Design a protein around this ligand. Structure first.
Ligand SMILES: COc1c(NC(=O)c2ccc(NC(=O)c3ccc(N4C(=O)C[C@H](NC(=O)c5ccc(NC(=O)/C(C)=C/c6ccc(O)cc6)cc5)C4=O)cc3)c(OC)c2O)ccc(C(=O)O)c1O
Length: 212
């Protein structure tokens, strides 16, 4: 199944391919527990749901080798592979539940940095363009590997896309955006589930610097 979507060279470095049992048992537990919460009508802002969603993103980043290009590949499979549902037990409805629960874990943090109106805006618009982040993070990793110049046209285009996705949920207000960047500096959890590394983040912030 994975062969239809990953090269055999990629399958060597893709933890999903190896037979480990602790890795399989870990996902049997995470999926079984997600379906149980959904059966119980558990809301996404429930501590159990939030805790599960965080563990879900931690494990998913580990088992993609921190490679966002593999994350984007799995999302291609969930949309295009009919076997994904039966093979993994992960449904599109389940992903929507985990996505909302993980977002709630960050909104719980942002509520300390934002006012009631700012938070209300972000809670509504956080999901507008959320699914486009993995494709951007993969291009950022690529630009970093290839030693692309942040000031080059291509590098500024990546900075522009980051700004587009960031303003989507933070808004255009300069003061409000400052709060987000300050929270990002103080809260390590806010950088979970991003596939971002200090090296890429450093490349991104040079590109944003030139854009200013
Ligand atoms: C704003 O802050 C900043 C930032 N920020 C950022 O750079 C930043 C970067 C990135 C993000 N986001 C993301 O990366 C980001 C990740 C992900 C999604 N995602 C969704 O939600 C839905 C969608 N699917 C999934 O999730 C999904 C879930 C589960 C699976 N399971 C499986 O397949 C299988 C098969 C399992 C299995 C089971 C059994 C087996 O037997 C075998 C297998 C599959 C798929 C998706 O992919 C979406 C997004 C981000 O957040 C928005 C960021 O903010 C930078 C600088 C400053 C500054 O200060 O300069 C700053 O302030």
């Amino acid at each position: 199944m994975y062969d239809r979507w990953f090269s055999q060279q990629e399958l060597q470095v893709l933890p999903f391919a190896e037979q480990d049992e602790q890795r399989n048992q870990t996902w049997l537990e995470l999926v079984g527990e997600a379906q149980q919460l959904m059966d119980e009508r558990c809301p996404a802002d429930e501590p159990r749901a939030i805790a599960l969603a965080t563990r879900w993103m931690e494990q998913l980043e580990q088992d993609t080798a921190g490679r966002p290009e593999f994350l984007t590949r799995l999302n291609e499979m969930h949309a295009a592979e009919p076997q994904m549902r039966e093979q993994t037990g992960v449904t599109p409805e389940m992903i929507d539940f985990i996505t909302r629960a993980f977002a709630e874990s960050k909104l719980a943090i942002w509520a300390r940095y934002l006012n009631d109106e700012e938070l209300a805006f972000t809670r509504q618009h956080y999901f507008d363009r959320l699914a486009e982040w993995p494709a951007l993070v993969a291009d950022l990793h690529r630009a970093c590997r290839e030693k692309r110049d942040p000031a080059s046209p291509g590098g500024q285009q990546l900075a522009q896309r980051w700004l587009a996705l960031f303003q989507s949920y933070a808004g255009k207000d300069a003061q409000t955006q400052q709060k987000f960047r300050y929270a990002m500096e103080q809260e390590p959890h806010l950088m979970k589930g991003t596939w971002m590394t200090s090296e890429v983040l450093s490349w991104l912030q040079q590109a944003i610097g030139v854009m200013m």
